[model samples]
Target chain A: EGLARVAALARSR
Target chain B: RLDKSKVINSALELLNEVGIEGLTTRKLAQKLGVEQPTLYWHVKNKRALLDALAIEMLDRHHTHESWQDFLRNNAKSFRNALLSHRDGAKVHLGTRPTEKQYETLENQLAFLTQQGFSLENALYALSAVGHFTLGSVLEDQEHMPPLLRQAIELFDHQGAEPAFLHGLESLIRGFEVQLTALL
Candidate 1:
């Protein structure tokens, strides 16, 4: 979940 | 019970206490009240013990999460892993796994898809982030030498690099601008 959240944040911004 | 197992436990204890450079099978066995040969029965060698420690660190910290959270969590976890022991990054970077680090990479791919990134772009981005995290964490653990520190200080004084203090903000702004342009 942590990894996913970080990756998403990286992608989003 | 097998008194032989104390060696394994001792190895872990020593790892947390002294780190990789200070860790030796002999010392581990001594601490465990056993011979090094006996300790070697549980772990073939120091390298094997390091691998076990790495796996243990990952298993303890890495968990199921969304990609965005995963990246942040991973960054935190990676830093935590290094902080957990001495020369932790050295052990981690040295050991090459037979397969990709699955949990983290999968999360990254999922986040990229959600962001409407092309598969190719997602791959590139993931690689970039992974490398950045690895490099940054490793650098963080190792004390910067005087020469390198002085060089950075000189650059800071020279004002040769704008926005060094807010580079992360600049990165975010650039990403936002570029993605909007892309759309």
Candidate 2:
């Protein structure tokens, strides 16, 4: 979940 | 070893043998010839048992010189760790970093920083690769929806190792470009 949420937040920006 | 370690080992075997869902405390106790609560003597529940198993799975050698080599070796090792067991990737996805995973993160960060990545960029790249690898394995083990799989032969499906390595390389190259742009 830790990494999962972070990836979601980054959004390739 | 104590009952706890014994239980952990038994759970490890059970995990590889039966996959995650079959890894219940009751079943593990039976596998060890002990009563159900006896497992509780070591691990409190399925979650704790999985936590230990994830650590055991990752507790292996990972030495490499360059950042790319380290990431490649580590990525392959991580995938291999998952492939070696039934539903292993699923199991690995559930636990937080234990000692070896923490060590891996620190080492990767150190190498990235040495390579001129700012601390923030290193952390960001590491996190991206980390999540990408996890989701890749998890998805690899899942049945791809054919509708989602049919363009360009639908992206021309590849085997797990090939697909993973391709994704890893792409991710690394993209990260490098971004890192250079920032520089």
Candidate 3:
């Protein structure tokens, strides 16, 4: 769940 | 009449008590029951002495099964080592590696290249993770502003470790993606 946010942030950027 | 480990270890001990700002060669010499001149004989100055302490903080023989595992474990170990002492992040942030240290770095780069990352990418990956871990540890150990503390509380109150692990994992996965595309 924590890394999910990171992945999302990575994709968004 | 002192050895390298003794002086470095004593400095580390004093650093925990006084933090970096209060640490000085004179104070370390007093703690070791030696003259200041003798201390200089071992370490050129406070900057050089701190570099020695930084090198001592590392786990030189970290073993890992893969490149990703190596980065994860290495970054965690680096962060934990810095957290082990007072002002640890500050102590480590600017210390230059000695000539003797280049061999280990070369070995690590070689290992990464063998594992599939281009040499340039491997270097960039290491630098990225290293800088991120340093910044994370710095923020974790330093004084925080009240507003930032409140902001963190509002965002699920996740502390340093969880946030660090998330970023670390993201970085490794990103590198893996890049490697897959290249190969």
Every candidate's CA RMSD: 7.8, 5.4, 6.2
Off by over 4 Å in 1: A1-13, B1-9, B64-69, B98-100, B143-178, B181-183
Model 3: per-residue Cα lDDT over B1-183, one tens digit each: 378778878998999989999999999999999998988888788888888788787644222298888999988888888888888889887878777569878988999999878899999999999899988787666534665445545444565687789999999998888887635
Superposition error at A7 for model 2 (Å): 14
Off by over 4 Å in 3: A1-13, B59-64, B144-158
- Candidate 2 chain B: 10-residue stretch with minimal lDDT: B55-64
Candidate 2 collision pairs = B150-B154, B151-B154
Predicted complex 2: DockQ: 0.08
Candidate 1 residues B1-183, lDDT tens each? 225445445666787788778898778777777677766777687888777666555555544354444444455565566555666667675553423455545666777678776666666555544555556556656756999999899767765223322443343344446445436
Q: Per-chain TM-score of chain B, candidate 1?
A: 0.67
Which stretch of 10 consecutive residues in model 3 chain B shows the poorest summed lDDT? B148-157
Prediction 3 TM-score vs. true:
0.78
Model 2, C-alpha of A3: deviation from truth (Å) = 11
lDDT of 2: 0.68
Q: Give the best candidate by TM-score.
A: 3
| DockQ of candidate 1 relative to the true structure | 0.05
Residue-by-residue lDDT tens digits, candidate 2, B36-145:
67656776888877877766665542222767776666667766666666777788664655444455556666778999889888877766776777787787676467
